[PDB]
């Protein structure tokens, strides 16, 4: 009864505090992940975020693909790339057998526009053996569901041969209708170290 | 009632993770809000923030009004203005009919001095049609309650002609007794876009 | 007549050499005046930037507000703010009772475009007791005459109570038709020290 309820609440809070998943994120930057910027799609650069010093216009702030592997997901703390399809290449902190992936986007209830049309829709994840390789091994094809939860997990394909990777490419084949850009809030990679 | 209890816990955690309100904050900087700094009162210079580069301390700075529209509210992460009276002008991310406002201050249990005497006490919120207008439409008069919860919500006045605003002015007429400054941790504006 | 003519010419040259007015300019920067840039409207954003650092373009501006209190008024040595409305805050070299103000703009004959549509048109001058007070005391409402002389003087309102000011606000409510910016060449404040 009361003790059972306190146990359930404590378990829920503990899981929430463990990055909401309780699973290692091998793409997390602070843990060792990095973005291969030269292998990323073009960043959407608008001139609408003006940084100024003593009233002097200084520079137009855009967001780096690095934010995709940073845990902050308040609205706007996302990488916006140009158009409605794009790609991101992440070097993991460790050589792992990839088991699952996680995509997070803001809920509609926190979006100023009422919609998340900029969220990724159709995407796939590939493993790469070297940073110069163009064609990777397909780790999975998925769709991020705009009517689903903010955080969504996707299970990687089971292959008879468990090949390890330290580089993964995320290809976004479509977004949810925004005509100008696509916004990625966070992408996580889960698996087993070698 | 185990499933119902788990559902209650899940709903509470979901709401908590949705910025504790589940409501868009149209003043949030990362989402599109901005401080019209030229229309803010004088900053109290505390010089309690250390800057560092590559682990090397460089100099001590004070906090910009910008922090009022940034979500971190650990003690010290607030904008301190001189005295017990001041004002802040925020440009919202969207043209909205304002419904409510939120003011946050640290709980007494986390204040080193045992009190929150620097917290705002008496304040009012006005809607402005352009950034150059002096006299705004009163959206409400309120008191932040030092014996209340850390996060407090305040309902805007309903006007029969709901004129929309994209600029709001927060006027703090009094604090809770600190004679040197008043520290503002976070201010949010909620409403419906046009 | 020859001696009288020589006297008239000498008098005209003397007045011309005395900053064309023979009156103290309490806003003149070299004489002790200063721009409270933190309280000025934002400087006009020029399409192109001046520097580039680490591939990021920096400094999208032409002139600092300081030029408004410097005597050089060759074309281009003016402060441009965005649009047709703006404000400038000046700390005077002394605490004075303000008597008059001066606005200068280039003559149409020296403008490359043939017009001075970027010149200020409708403006007002206010006295401030502190730089952070919201509403200042109106010292006068004026129009700069596009068909008038390059230098124009404006008489301050006579107040029954002789209150002094050391901070003045210049508000430009309109320009002479330029749709992108307004350029201020020089603003002077004349009066009596306390």
């Amino acid at each position: 009864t009361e003790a059972q309820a306190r146990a359930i609440v404590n378990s829920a809070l503990k899981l929430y505090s463990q990055d909401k998943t309780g699973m290692v994120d091998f793409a997390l930057e602070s843990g060792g992940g990095s973005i291969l910027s030269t292998r990323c799609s073009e960043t959407y650069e608008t001139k609408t975020a003006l940084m100024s010093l003593f009233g002097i216009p200084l520079w137009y702030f855009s967001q780096s693909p690095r934010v995709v592997i940073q845990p902050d997901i308040y609205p706007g703390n996302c990488w916006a790339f140009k158009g409605s399809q794009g790609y991101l290449v992440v070097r993991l902190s460790m050589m792992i057998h990839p088991a699952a992936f996680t995509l997070e986007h803001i809920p509609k209830t926190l979006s100023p526009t009422g919609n998340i049309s900029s969220a990724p829709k159709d995407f796939a994840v590939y493993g790469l053996e070297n940073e110069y390789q163009e064609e990777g091994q397909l780790l999975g094809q998925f769709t991020y569901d705009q009517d689903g939860e903010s955080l969504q997990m996707f299970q990687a394909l089971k292959r008879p041969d468990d090949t390890a990777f330290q580089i993964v490419e995320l290809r976004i084949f479509s977004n949810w209708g925004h005509p100008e850009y696509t916004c990625l809030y966070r992408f996580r990679v889960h698996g087993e170290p070698v | 009632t185990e499933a119902q209890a788990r559902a209650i816990v899940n709903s509470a955690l979901k709401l908590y993770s949705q910025d504790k309100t589940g409501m868009v904050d149209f003043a949030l900087e990362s989402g599109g809000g901005s401080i019209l700094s030229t229309r803010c009162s004088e900053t109290y210079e505390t010089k309690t923030a250390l800057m560092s580069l590559f682990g090397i301390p460089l100099w001590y700075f004070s906090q910009s009004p910008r922090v009022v529209i940034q979500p971190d509210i650990y003690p010290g992460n607030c904008w301190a203005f001189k005295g017990s009276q001041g004002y802040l002008v925020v440009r919202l991310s969207m043209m909205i009919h304002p419904a409510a406002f939120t003011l946050e201050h640290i709980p007494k249990t986390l204040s080193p001095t045992g009190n929150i005497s620097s917290a705002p006490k008496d304040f009012a919120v006005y809607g402005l049609e352009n950034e150059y207008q002096e006299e705004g439409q009163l959206l409400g008069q309120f008191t932040y309650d030092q014996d209340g919860e850390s996060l407090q919500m305040f309902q805007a006045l309903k006007r029969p002609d709901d004129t929309a605003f994209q600029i709001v002015e927060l006027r703090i007429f009094s604090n809770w007794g600190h004679p040197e400054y008043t520290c503002l941790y976070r201010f949010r504006v909620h409403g419906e876009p046009v | 007549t020859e001696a009288q003519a020589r006297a008239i010419v000498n008098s005209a040259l003397k007045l011309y050499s005395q900053d064309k007015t023979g009156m103290v300019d309490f806003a003149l920067e070299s004489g002790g005046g200063s721009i409270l840039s933190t309280r000025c409207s934002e400087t006009y954003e020029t399409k192109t930037a001046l520097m580039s650092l680490f591939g990021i373009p920096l400094w999208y501006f032409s002139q600092s507000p300081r030029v408004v209190i410097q005597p050089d008024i060759y074309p281009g040595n003016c402060w441009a703010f965005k649009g047709s409305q703006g404000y400038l805050v000046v700390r005077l070299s002394m605490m004075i009772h303000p008597a008059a103000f001066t606005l200068e703009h280039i003559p149409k004959t020296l403008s490359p475009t043939g017009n001075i549509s970027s010149a200020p048109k409708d403006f007002a001058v206010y006295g401030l007791e502190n730089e952070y007070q919201e509403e200042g005391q109106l010292l006068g409402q004026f129009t700069y005459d596009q068909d008038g002389e390059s230098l124009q003087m404006f008489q301050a309102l006579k107040r029954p109570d002789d209150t002094a000011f050391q901070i003045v606000e210049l508000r430009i409510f309109s320009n002479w038709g330029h749709p992108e910016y307004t350029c201020l060449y020089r603003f002077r404040v004349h009066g009596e020290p306390v």
Binding site: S37, Y44, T46, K47, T48, A49, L50, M51, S52, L53, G55, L58, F61, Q63, S64, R66, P75, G76, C78, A80, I106, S111, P112, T113, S118, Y181, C183 | E29, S30, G31, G32, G33, S34, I35, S37, A49, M51, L53, F54, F61, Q63, S64, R66, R91, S93, M94 | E42, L53, F54, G55, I56
Partner: peptide
């Protein structure tokens, strides 16, 4: 290297600059 140097400079500059949104940022 370019982005890392720029982000170091951005971290130095961030708390002292003023940010104005002239239009909605990507969200």
């Amino acid at each position: 290297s370019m982005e890392d140097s720029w982000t170091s400079l951005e971290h130095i500059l961030w708390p002292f600059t003023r940010l104005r949104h002239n239009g909605p940022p990507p969200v």
